[PDB]
């Protein structure tokens, strides 16, 4: 029944900043609230429990406050190691409910993606499969939408996406979308196109090729 909402969903900041993330509960939970840090591919780590108690070993720049339905995590003096996802959690006797998570990232200017499309190689095609690749390079922030069109027909269910972490040099992201088809399905169509939307783009960007280049 208890719903937890974190604000904001994504927070852009710089080293040294003091940042705050808030967690709001749909009903009073006293102070039965905990905060967790999680880095990609790792397990969550408890930072703060009972709203304000700091777990032993956690640096003093982390602090928490609040009660009833409103809680706040504060990081005083952001360090590089602190860029990660943070989760709030109401914990009860038998169940637990978490927030949607807040990703803290390195602040930089908005950058629209550069889009490239790659047809399948003849070797792979002869082997019986066609992988068509769409690349979105060096964009910020991370949210982007990629759609595939084959002979102007919108595709669904035959693509997979992968996204990098913030680049160590320029703090951008890159994303790949791979459309996988059989050789026969590939060869019964001509125009292959990738369509991209991103907040830094005033209108969608399309990159395409004709089979048989």
């Amino acid at each position: 029944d208890v719903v937890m909402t974190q604000s904001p969903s994504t927070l852009s900041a710089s080293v040294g900043d003091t940042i705050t993330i808030t967690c709001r509960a749909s009903q009073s939970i006293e102070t039965w609230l905990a905060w967790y840090q999680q880095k990609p591919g790792k397990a969550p780590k408890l930072l703060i429990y009972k709203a304000s108690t700091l777990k032993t070993g956690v640096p003093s720049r982390f602090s928490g406050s609040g009660s009833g339905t409103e809680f706040t995590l504060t990081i005083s003096g952001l360090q590089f190691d602190d860029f990660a996802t943070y989760h709030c959690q109401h914990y009860a006797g038998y169940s637990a409910t978490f927030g949607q998570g807040t990703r803290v990232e390195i602040k930089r200017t908005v950058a629209a993606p550069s889009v490239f499309i790659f047809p399948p190689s003849d070797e792979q095609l002869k082997s019986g499969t066609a992988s068509v690749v769409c690349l979105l390079n060096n964009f910020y922030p991370r949210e982007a939408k990629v759609q595939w069109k084959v002979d102007n027909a919108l595709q669904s269910g035959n693509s997979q996406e992968s996204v990098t972490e913030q680049d160590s040099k320029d703090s951008t992201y890159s994303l790949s979308s791979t459309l996988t088809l059989s050789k026969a399905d590939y060869e019964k169509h001509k125009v292959y196109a990738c369509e991209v939307t991103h907040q830094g783009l005033s209108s969608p960007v399309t990159k395409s090729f004709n089979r048989g280049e």
Binding site: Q38, K42, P44, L46, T85, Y91, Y94, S95, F98
Partner: protein
Amino acid sequence: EVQLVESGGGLVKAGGSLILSCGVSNFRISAHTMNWVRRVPGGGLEWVASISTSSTYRDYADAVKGRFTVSRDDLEDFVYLQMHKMRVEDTAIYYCARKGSDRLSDNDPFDAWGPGTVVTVSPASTKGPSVFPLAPSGTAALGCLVKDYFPEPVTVSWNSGALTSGVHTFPAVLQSSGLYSLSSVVTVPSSSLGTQTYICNVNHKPSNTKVDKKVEPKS
């Protein structure tokens, strides 16, 4: 250092079943409520299930109630999560998490976590077969190869059931890809290869697929 480790993750098809377990190092689970949590795509955490001490109560999230089961083994310190009738939205990283236990507090957070195990539910619960001919080249043999289908079974007839003498449809074999394959053969008079047409009718009910394949000599 208190440690937890999950096992049993992998690839399953929608509608299938998969069981995870969790072992521990440097503590006994008996005094702790144990939990399963999953990280979904998008980065959010999602509580899945909990089992209290002495198994007095077993609690499940709404999205999994009736499909998942949690069990505990306090004597050798294991926790189990059975997942049945699995859906694509079950794809996630699954962690086992310990709830704290204090003589000084009646309600504790999740203070120790395992590193997680990946569970992937592929969207296709069924797949129709590809049908290829086995060309015949006194008595000749011909047939149909029915390859790459899921799940069992496939039904094969010849000439809409008019031809049954000398027909052998073999038991399906499970290929390394996880898909099934079989063959159906029939022996016929060699002189009839010019006059009579031979058609195999393949029916795969789970995917509502029907294929009629004409088998002729090749040249």
